[PDB]
């Protein structure tokens, strides 16, 4: 007979047919999936008196355990079974309630924001309820649904209750972001943005995904703080961090201005770096997992040698700061010294007036001042061989993979900002954000400036042709610009940067997949002109959308500080060596757009930045950012078992992909980053990768590390993030 | 190790057919001329053609001047120095003859009672007793020691082979069997506490634990209210966790469900309860503690083993002739073999207990196109194991008619007209619907009237050396691989699972099983008919789990499953390694 304990707390006969129907419902349209196999593997685990909910858990997991290269469709079977499970949990049935009835109920529960009820009328919810297509839930992969259930769907974190489904999440996000639009257009915007995100054309970041529609206003996920050379600024920086990490933001800290140990603050940088680290970890589980930062300083800082070894697990406690990452800042001259085999002079930034400023803003001024202070020997200095310093850096980069590079001249010669008024002097955690900052006197200093950026991405595998990006860019810029006015700012200098510059960072996902379906590869140069064509479309249409927005709602207060304002464009300033590795002409009318930008300006000072996506891109089953996949199948752990994901369309494209370790070297990849960088406002999270077995005695030579570094420089790469080393 | 040989000069004196005919001869020597030789022929045929598998002591000894054939003994130890010494002396005597030992020592009072020093120093003594005849204190001489889960000292005992302590609180070279019942599990489920008592402070509590579950209920809850009684309170999840944690890492902490051993048993737990098992956990017989090595009033359990080869029989009706042959042969051995300890002779002559099991079960499932893990083998197992028990019961019944029932027959549930088909865990109904094929009701009556020659007949033992002789899969275990590798003085010895050529895809190798559920359902189904118990393992592959770690939730789940389906004992836990 076999008995089942129902959802309330009573028993009944086991319904073997109802289970079979749900399985058959889930398998519809799927290939290479045995419903019979899942049935055998889950039926054997049942027992007299089993809770109904555990039957669902058992069938889901049974389907999930079969995910593979030979039968990737188990991704979708398992998913739909979970959606089915999640529906019952949330509503007590498969069919979601009517939108209004749901919104009402949730506001009363304090889980949705009450402004929704004010901003929209019942009739307007009836109309939004018709935009929705709940069957789009049938289109998630298993991993995607695990992410929704883990961290996106409005849920009770205490009792483990799920309150909504993915389409309510999407419509309501659309609603809050366009709430302030006029009735004339309000709802048509709402429909179009819902469509774009529910069909995975636009990818949304985690804080937006889990928060917008809820009573929270915390959406800033990355902040950039410059720290001046005084205790007041140090404390101010430290307080800002604590405030931001308590809201889960990732931090980018510039601390290169702090004077060296032994100067006229006797104790130097390291004790303060330690303090910033404890600042970052001040809201972490136990001082480990959670809270992250990258800290930036110039290569020529007097104390640089001590700083290069800071996460080297091989020292004494007093001269180590292991749990932050570091970004070393370099320019043309630093490299020339390496090439010429000469020396590099180390100064404390406090003994060389005007030297730090020029480093970022003016390369020839840096030239004169640098050589000057090298002749002038009343000035405190250390002389080091350029090969040794570069070697040390790369040696620490190689072993930790967590010493980064920033080319500060590229960040300013090829930038949407006038380095004279607003230079770029640092980046964020992952190295894609590149915005102006100003140090603070005090946590509440009005004259300080902390940079903020609001992110999103286009899915290159969900767009059929590049002209779709027009409608999508309008939708993405307008949505994210509305968020700027919606979200809280816990530190006044942060509100300054966001309202003054209105900076955005819209990037890409599914790039590997996109290259695959166009029959191109990373490593051989075959993708060069396609990347040029693809990334020109992206930037032209983002610039266009922000331009229409400036015409509708006025340019950004601090617009006059951009190179855009002076009629300059990315196509005018890019590293000129890109000409030698691609010949794709420009397809869009850049000259008309120049004029239209001259006249009416841009709503946002920056629009584009290529971030790593990781949690995000799972939602739409996509390759991460612009990275090649490590394998065909991605494995993850969870409380619920092994979570597997198959790269999209493996069936037809397995040989079309170029997996990470199939690349003979880094050159091909770096050429594409350079080509992308021609159009990108900010920067790109770009990695270098090395497989020991491709080398004699399994040792990666320094010569190749320095070579790939110089390559990235040659093609106008702004930043270099992770170094990944394969292991046997 | 079988052929009569000179162990000094390395000379071999016989061949395998002389071994087989002469074994047949010694076992039937006392039969009347009328039938003597026809029995001899038929048993020779059965064993020479691998239908019946014989154990090592019988294989190497019968026909020789030796009379040492007991390979497993079960000793209960009472809570006194006289009994402790008696137990210890019995062990020494038996291990000098290569027997494996099962020791019940749960009655020994806890450290700190009104024998101040507690169980562990005595456990150590039993261990040296076991190893007293071993090559150098290592290889050879083996024992499993049993005690209740609620023993006051249980926590110290659970960690006894944990290689990670001080010498004084460790007994590494014995195995342990923890004894559990319905109530112990309910505490786990309900999230409640478990109360630990010394068996000496709770009169009548130990007795009920085995014999009477509702009496245990009342006494347990009573002594929990009564706080003049020495006690420790522990959280049920923590105790089960600790046990399973030590089981997981050593694979050598066993489980015995003492209620199942008595509710579904060929013995009246009121007169002769089952309070322990043997080394490998398949034997389940009554015992009584001894005053003295030569105490006539004590009782040490003994069992004589054999097995049917399920891959050499064409159809189940062959088991009639084979069961007659196997029961009659092994029953004759009882009268033939020496008994070095009087309490052992008592159990063997009084109860005449046998343990006939199976080999080639994996192979048999393979040729019927069935598997372990999916439930596809359920009704076939039910059909196969009903044939086994019906025909063994029949053969022993004909023997009782010919030569009289066993002296202590009146102490069996059989004597009261009860049968295994009446007492089995009732959840088996939900996982198999094979009806019964043989006339059990006629046999009931025939058992009522004329009784059984033997108090038990069936027990599923691991075979290892035995089953090599006929190239067979071991006992009821799935093979680890297609090819089994062993070392010897002579080179790498390899063996291929039988009929690999035609059945390679039909097999289901051990690590191909997604989990334990399918296997445990078959053990439960087998247990419906088995008099004694089954050596059943649990198996886990780390790589089937996140971060290569086997969760406790699954360990406790599979434990409860085995309970739910009336599994009596759980032997090895095997963990795969990369």
């Amino acid at each position: 007979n076999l008995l089942v304990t129902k959802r309330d707390g009573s028993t009944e006969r086991i319904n073997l047919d109802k289970i079979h129907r749900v399985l058959d419902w889930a398998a519809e349209g799927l290939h290479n999936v045995s419903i019979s196999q899942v049935e055998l593997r889950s039926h054997i685990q049942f027992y007299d008196g089993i809770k109904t909910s555990d039957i669902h858990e058992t069938i889901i997991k049974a389907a999930a355990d079969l995910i593979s290269r030979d039968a990737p469709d188990y991704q979708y079977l398992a998913a739909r079974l979970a959606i089915f499970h999640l529906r019952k949990k949330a509503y007590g049935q498969f069919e979601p309630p009517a939108l209004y009835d749901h919104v009402v109920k949730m506001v009363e529960m304090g889980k949705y924001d009450n402004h929704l009820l004010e901003d929209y009328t019942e009739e307007e919810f009836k109309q939004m309820d018709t935009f929705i297509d709940h069957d789009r839930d049938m289109t998630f992969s298993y991993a995607a649904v695990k992410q929704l259930e883990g961290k996106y769907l409005v849920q009770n974190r205490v009792t483990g209750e799920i309150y909504e489904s993915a389409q309510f999440l999407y419509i309501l996000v659309a609603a809050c972001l366009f709430s302030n639009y006029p009735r004339e257009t309000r709802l048509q915007y709402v429909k179009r943005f819902y469509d774009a995100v529910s069909t995975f054309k636009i990818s949304l970041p985690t804080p937006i995904m889990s928060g917008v529609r809820t009573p929270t206003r915390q959406f800033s996920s990355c902040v950039l703080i410059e720290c001046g050379d005084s205790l007041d600024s140090i404390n101010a920086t430290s307080s800002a961090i604590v405030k931001y990490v308590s809201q889960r933001a990732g931090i980018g800290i510039n601390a290169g201005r702090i004077r060296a140990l032994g100067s006229p603050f006797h104790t130097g940088c390291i004790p303060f770096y330690k303090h910033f680290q404890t600042a970052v970890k001040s809201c972490s589980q136990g001082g480990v997992r959670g809270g992250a930062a990258t800290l930036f300083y110039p290569m020529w800082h007097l104390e640089v040698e001590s700083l290069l070894v800071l996460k080297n697990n091989r020292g004494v406690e007093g001269n180590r700061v292991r749990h932050m990452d570091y970004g070393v800042q370099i320019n043309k001259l630093m490299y020339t010294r390496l090439l010429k085999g000469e020396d590099i002079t180390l100064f404390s930034p406090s003994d060389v007036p005007g030297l730090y400023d020029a480093f970022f803003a003016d390369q020839e001024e840096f030239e004169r001042l640098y050589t000057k202070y090298e002749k002038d020997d009343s000035i405190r200095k250390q002389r080091v061989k350029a090969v040794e310093l570069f070697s040390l850096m790369m040696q620490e980069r190689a072993s930790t993979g967590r010493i980064y590079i920033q080319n500060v001249d590229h960040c300013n010669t090829h930038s949407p900002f006038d380095p004279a008024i607003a230079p770029v002097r640092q980046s964020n955690l992952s190295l894609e954000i590149a915005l102006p900052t100003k140090p603070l006197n005090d946590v509440n200093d009005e004259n300080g400036e902390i940079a903020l950026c609001t992110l999103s991405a286009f899915n290159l595998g969900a767009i059929n042709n590049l002209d779709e990006l027009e409608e999508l860019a309008i939708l993405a810029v307008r949505a994210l610009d509305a968020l700027l006015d919606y979200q809280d700012y816990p530190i006044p200098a942060a509100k300054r940067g966001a309202m003054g510059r209105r900076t955005l960072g819209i990037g890409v996902i599914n790039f590997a997949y996109y290259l695959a379906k166009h029959g191109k590869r990373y490593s051989d140069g075959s993708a060069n002109n396609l990347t040029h064509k693809t990334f020109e479309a992206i930037q032209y249409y983002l610039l266009k959308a922000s331009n229409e927005l400036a015409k509708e709602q006025g340019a950004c207060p601090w617009f006059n500080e951009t190179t855009y304002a002076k009629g300059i464009l990315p196509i005018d300033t890019y590293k000129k060596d890109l000409d030698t590795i691609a010949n794709e002409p420009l397809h869009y009318d850049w000259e008309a757009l120049r004029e239209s930008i001259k006249t009416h300006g841009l709503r946002n000072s920056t629009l584009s930045a290529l971030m790593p996506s990781e949690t995000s891109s799972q939602i739409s089953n996509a390759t991460n950012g612009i990275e090649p996949p490590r394998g065909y199948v991605s494995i993850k752990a969870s409380k619920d078992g092994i979570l597997r994901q198959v790269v999209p369309d493996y069936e037809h494209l397995h040989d079309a992909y170029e997996l990470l370790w199939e690349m003979p070297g880094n050159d091909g990849y770096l050429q594409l980053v350079g080509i992308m960088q021609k159009f990108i406002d900010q920067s790109i999270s770009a990695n270098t990768n090395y497989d020991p077995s491709r080398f004699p005695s399994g040792k990666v030579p320094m010569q190749q590390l320095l070579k790939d570094l110089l390559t990235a420089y040659k093609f106008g790469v702004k930043t270099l993030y992770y170094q990944n080393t394969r292991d046997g | 190790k079988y052929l009569v040989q000179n162990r000094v000069t390395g000379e071999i004196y016989e061949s395998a057919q002389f071994l087989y005919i002469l074994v047949a001869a010694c076992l039937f020597s006392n039969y009347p001329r009328e039938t003597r030789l026809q029995y001899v022929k038929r048993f020779y045929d059965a064993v020479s053609t691998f239908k019946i598998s014989l154990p090592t002591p019988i294989m190497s000894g019968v026909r020789t001047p030796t009379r040492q054939f007991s390979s497993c003994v079960l000793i209960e130890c009472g809570d006194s120095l006289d009994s402790i010494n008696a137990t210890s002396s019995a062990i020494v005597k038996y291990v000098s003859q290569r027997a494996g030992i099962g020791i019940n020592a749960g009655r020994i009072r806890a450290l700190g009672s009104p024998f101040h020093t507690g169980c562990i120093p005595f456990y150590k003594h039993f261990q040296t007793a076991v190893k007293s005849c071993s090559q150098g204190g290592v290889r050879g001489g083996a024992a499993t020691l049993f005690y209740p889960m609620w023993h006051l000292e249980v926590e110290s005992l659970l960690v006894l082979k944990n290689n990670r302590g001080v010498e004084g609180n460790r007994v590494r070279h014995m195995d342990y069997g923890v004894q559990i019942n319905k109530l112990m599990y309910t505490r786990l489920l309900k999230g409640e506490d478990i109360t630990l008592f010394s068996p000496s402070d709770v009169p009548g509590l130990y007795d009920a634990f085995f014999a009477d579950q509702e009496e245990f209920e009342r006494l347990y809850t009573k002594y929990e209210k009564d706080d003049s009684i020495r006690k420790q309170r522990v959280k049920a999840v923590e105790l089960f966790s600790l046990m399973m944690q030590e089981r997981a890492s050593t694979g050598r902490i066993y489980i015995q469900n003492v209620d199942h051993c008595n509710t579904h048993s060929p013995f009246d737990p009121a007169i002769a309860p089952v309070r322990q098992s043997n080394l490998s956990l398949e034997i389940a017989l009554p015992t009584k503690p001894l005053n003295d090595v030569n105490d006539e009033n004590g009782e040490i359990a003994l069992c004589t083993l054999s097995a049917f080869n399920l891959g050499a029989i064409n159809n189940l009706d062959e088991l009639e002739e084979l069961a007659i042959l196997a029961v009659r042969a092994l029953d004759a051995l009882l009268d033939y073999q020496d008994y070095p300890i009087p309490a052992a002779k008592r159990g063997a002559m009084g109860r005449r207990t046998l343990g006939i099991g199976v080999i080639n079960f994996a192979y048999y499932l393979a040729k019927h196109g069935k598997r372990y893990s999916d439930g596809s083998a359920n009704n076939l197992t039910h059909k196969t194991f009903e044939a086994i028990q019906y025909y063994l019961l029949k053969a022993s019944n004909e023997l009782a008619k010919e030569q009289g029932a066993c002296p202590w027959f009146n102490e069996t549930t059989y004597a009261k007209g009860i049968l295994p088909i009446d007492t089995y865990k009732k959840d088996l109904d939900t996982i198999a619907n094979e009806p019964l094929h043989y006339d059990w009701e006629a046999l009931r009556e025939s058992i009522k009237t004329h009784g059984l020659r033997n108090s038990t007949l069936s027990a599923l033992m691991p075979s290892e050396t035995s089953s090599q002789i006929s190239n067979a899969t071991n006992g009821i275990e799935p093979p680890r691989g297609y090819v089994s590798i062993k070392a010897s003085k002579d080179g790498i010895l390899r063996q291929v699972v039988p009929d690999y050529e035609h059945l390679h895809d039909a097999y289901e190798l051990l690590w191909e099983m997604p989990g334990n559920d399918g296997y445990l359902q078959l053990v439960g189904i087998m247990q419906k008919f088995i008099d004694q118990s089954i050596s059943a393992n649990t198996n886990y592959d780390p790589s089937r789990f996140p971060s290569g770690k086997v969760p406790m939730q699954q360990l406790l789940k599979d434990l409860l499953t085995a309970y739910k389906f009336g599994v009596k004992t759980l032997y090895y836990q095997n963990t795969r390694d990369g």
Partner: peptide, 16 residues
Amino acid sequence: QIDSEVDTDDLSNFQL
């Protein structure tokens, strides 16, 4: 090595 994943609610359902 093993994980001490002990969920008392999950267990409590089982019928012995």
